[PDB]
Write an enzyme that holds these catalytic residues in place. Structure first.
Site, PDB file in Angstrom:
ATOM      1  N   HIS A  24     -17.226  -8.982  -9.509  1.00  0.00           N
ATOM      2  CA  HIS A  24     -16.646  -8.192 -10.584  1.00  0.00           C
ATOM      3  C   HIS A  24     -17.470  -8.259 -11.863  1.00  0.00           C
ATOM      4  O   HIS A  24     -17.287  -7.415 -12.746  1.00  0.00           O
ATOM      5  CB  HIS A  24     -15.221  -8.671 -10.836  1.00  0.00           C
ATOM      6  N   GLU A  27       0.828  -1.198   0.000  1.00  0.00           N
ATOM      7  CA  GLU A  27       0.000   0.000   0.000  1.00  0.00           C
ATOM      8  C   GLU A  27       0.868   1.257   0.000  1.00  0.00           C
ATOM      9  O   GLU A  27       0.543   2.255  -0.659  1.00  0.00           O
ATOM     10  CB  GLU A  27      -0.926  -0.035   1.215  1.00  0.00           C
TER      11      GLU A  27
END
Ligand SMILES: *[C@@H]1O[C@H](CO)[C@@H](O[C@@H]2O[C@H](CO)[C@@H](O[C@@H]3O[C@H](CO)[C@@H](O)[C@H](O)[C@@H]3O)[C@H](O)[C@H]2NC(C)=O)[C@H](O)[C@H]1NC(C)=O
Ligand SMILES: *[C@@H]1O[C@H](CO)[C@@H](O[C@@H]2O[C@H](CO)[C@@H](O[C@@H]3O[C@H](CO)[C@@H](O)[C@H](O)[C@@H]3O)[C@H](O)[C@H]2NC(C)=O)[C@H](O)[C@H]1NC(C)=O
Ligand SMILES: *[C@@H]1O[C@H](CO)[C@@H](O)[C@H](O)[C@H]1NC(C)=O
EC number: 3.4.17.23
Length: 592
Positions: free
Chosen positions: A487, A357
């Site tokens: 998705h 991250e």
């Protein structure tokens, strides 16, 4: 004033107001995503809706400027992106229709609770109850029931919805200059101008397919190994020269075979490196995790986090004072306010996750120099790929010994290396074919090549010929198993995972080759390689200003994807699998 000068004035206005409005939106979203509070929820909605309206109106105005008459590819790209209004062209009636369809499909998906035969109340929603079953169960019948029920009570419901969703989305696509919703999505990889740094949308099909050709052998031998071990666990149902049952893949869809590790662990005694206990002992706190990550990025030559990062980020759960969403997120609110949200615990996983991250954060800081519409990764996979290469380097026991989380005398036995590489395989090499097949089915369906009468049929035909997986229970066109994935039911691309995966190893091998590392590519820590971080920055700063091909060339040395790095990373595992699979069958029966 040439139309382009007027354009410059337009964009210079857009980015100047946008940068702002997006910062206001992002701050409101930090408020909600942190201080869950109806009020803050409402404010989030307000600010995000204002962003929506601004972008829409500015997109129309940008259309009033003609791309064909823009010189500087940079200006042309910003305009082109802003000119891609999308849903605007469709009538507000049709707009509300598709909005209602997407909302209804997502609501069906979220409201998904299947009940267990023999239990009139064992009915449990997906995320709380069903997945653990599909990941930590060894009962063919239980997993079967779960898989069937989802694709039955949920996919069927979505079937008519997705049917009309395809027509509406296709009209929207052709509403813009596009042949199908497939070409619209493929355009995210389309970039033009510069010398040969152009990539036509239809080239994406060619490149994905040839890369999958080269990855196919590895997936074949992985298929063999997983198949055989699972056979020993589920002997009554698995065929040695057959495809694999879908419900036994480790998750409802079998997108990552990672959960199959206990049933497919090479060796199985040599423990798995888990510095988690060591961190727990050295009292490493969340801040220490992120600080060591900072030190890593400084070591490769990248900057260190802003004061704003340490002062404004949420690196820990908010005790019990507030209610928060834990899913790790990296945040570029604009205006230099970089942050990271994570419920960081004391665990190797959260450690590697912080490195990933923070790599996202470093990318964000590197392209702040670029204007707003160019402040993003070159394609949709550059970002998460950078993130992942960070974890790769931070997982090598070399770096673990440096930070003092593993004794110096510790040595890597080839057995543990094979174990680790196999776990990486399932999670990476497993989703690769799944991803290719999913996006190929969607692409052709939008192109119309798959008629509705053979909509689901082909799906499982490919699931066998490509993924090597077979349907436990035959499913007719009443079903709609593709929509069973978030998705897909919520209108999101999926090839991004495939591309990201291919990219990250290319990046890692180039950078390692810079650090003058010698030996297996699974043993690389670019730490202290100033030149490596320099090349990385020389790309990261480019943002999407330059073609994604150009960014790639500046880093890896090529203008297009190449799987050779991925194979080199897993080549040890490939050879061990080949030998372990000599006296067995490598392949699968199409019709089975
Ligand atoms: C980041 O790494 C640099 C590498 O030299 C360390 O040196 C520090 O560089 C900063 C910026 O040039 C110097 O200014 C400081 O900025 C921070 C952030 O606002 C501020 O809190 C400090 O009071 C100071 O103004 C700093 O003097 C210098 N420190 C040294 C050489 O010890 C730097 O330590 C690293 N970042 C931080 C925040 O310390
Ligand atoms: C990447 O480079 C870093 C350097 O920033 C390497 O860490 C460094 O490792 C050396 C050798 O263990 C440490 O030496 C120490 O020196 C102090 C000086 O007072 C001494 O008290 C200790 O007994 C020890 O000999 C050095 O401090 C350390 N750097 C730090 C902690 O900032 C790292 O090993 C390199 N990693 C790779 C993969 O090349
Ligand atoms: C959280 O939201 C409540 C309700 O809107 C508000 O009164 C409170 O001040 C907020 N606190 C924080 C820390 O965000």
């Amino acid at each position: 004033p040439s139309t382009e000068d007027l354009v410059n004035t337009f964009l210079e206005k857009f980015n100047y107001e946008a940068e702002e409005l997006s910062y206001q939106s992002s701050l409101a979203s930090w408020d909600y995503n942190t201080n869950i509070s109806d009020e803050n929820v409402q404010k989030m909605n307000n600010a995000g809706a204002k962003w929506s309206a601004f972008y829409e109106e500015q997109s129309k105005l940008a259309k009033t400027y003609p791309l064909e008459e823009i010189q500087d590819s940079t200006v042309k790209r910003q305009l082109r992106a802003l000119q891609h209004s999308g849903s605007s062209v469709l009538s507000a009636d049709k707009n509300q229709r598709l909005n209602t369809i997407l909302n209804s499909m997502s609501t069906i998906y979220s409201t998904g609770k299947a009940c267990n035969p023999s239990n009139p109340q064992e009915c449990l929603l997906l995320e709380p109850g069903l997945d653990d079953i599909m990941e930590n169960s060894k009962d063919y019948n239980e997993r079967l029931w779960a898989w069937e029920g989802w694709r039955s009570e949920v996919g069927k419901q979505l079937r008519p919805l997705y049917e009309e969703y395809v027509a509406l989305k296709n009209e929207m696509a052709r509403a813009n200059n596009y042949e199908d919703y497939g070409d619209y999505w493929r355009g995210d990889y389309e970039e033009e101008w510069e010398n040969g740094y152009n990539y036509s949308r239809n080239q994406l099909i060619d490149d994905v397919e040839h890369t999958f050709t080269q990855i196919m052998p590895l997936y074949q031998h992985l298929h063999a190994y997983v198949r055989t071990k699972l056979m020993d666990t589920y002997p009554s149902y698995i065929s040695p020269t057959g495809c694999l049952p879908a419900h036994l893949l480790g998750d409802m869809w079998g997108r990552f075979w990672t959960n199959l590790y206990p049933l497919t662990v090479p060796f199985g005694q040599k423990p798995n490196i888990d510095v988690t206990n060591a961190m727990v002992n050295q009292s490493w706190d969340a801040r220490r995790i992120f600080k060591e990550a900072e030190k890593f990025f400084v070591s490769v030559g990248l900057p260190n986090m802003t004061q704003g990062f340490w002062e404004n980020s949420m690196l820990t759960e908010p005790s019990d004072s507030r209610k928060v969403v834990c899913h790790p997120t990296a945040w570029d609110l604009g205006k230099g306010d970089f942050r990271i949200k994570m419920c960081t615990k004391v665990t190797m996983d959260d450690f590697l996750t912080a490195h990933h991250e923070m790599g996202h954060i470093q990318y964000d800081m590197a392209y702040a120099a670029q204007p707003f519409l160019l402040r993003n990764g070159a394609n949709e996979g550059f970002h998460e790929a950078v993130g992942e290469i960070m974890s790769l380097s931070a997982a090598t026991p070399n770096h673990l010994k440096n930070i003092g989380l593993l004794p110096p005398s510790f040595f890597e036995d080839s057995e543990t290396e094979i174990n680790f590489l196999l776990k990486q395989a399932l999670t990476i090499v497993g989703t690769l074919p799944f991803t290719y097949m999913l996006e190929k089915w969607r692409w052709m369906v939008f192109k119309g090549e798959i008629p509705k009468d053979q909509w689901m049929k082909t799906w499982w035909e490919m699931k066998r010929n490509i993924v090597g997986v077979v349907e436990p229970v035959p499913h007719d066109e009443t079903y709609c198993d593709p929509a069973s994935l978030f998705h897909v039911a919520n209108d999101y691309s999926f090839i991004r995972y495939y591309t990201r995966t291919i990219y990250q190893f290319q990046f890692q091998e180039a950078l390692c080759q810079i650090a003058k590392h010698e030996g297996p590519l699974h043993k690389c820590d670019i730490s202290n390689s100033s030149e490596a971080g320099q090349k990385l920055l020389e790309m990261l700063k480019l943002g999407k200003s330059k073609p994604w091909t150009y960014a790639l060339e500046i880093v890896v040395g090529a203008k297009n994807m190449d799987v050779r790095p991925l194979l080199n990373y897993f080549e040890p595992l490939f050879t061990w699998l080949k030998e372990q699979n000599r006296n067995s069958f490598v392949g699968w029966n199409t019709d089975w």
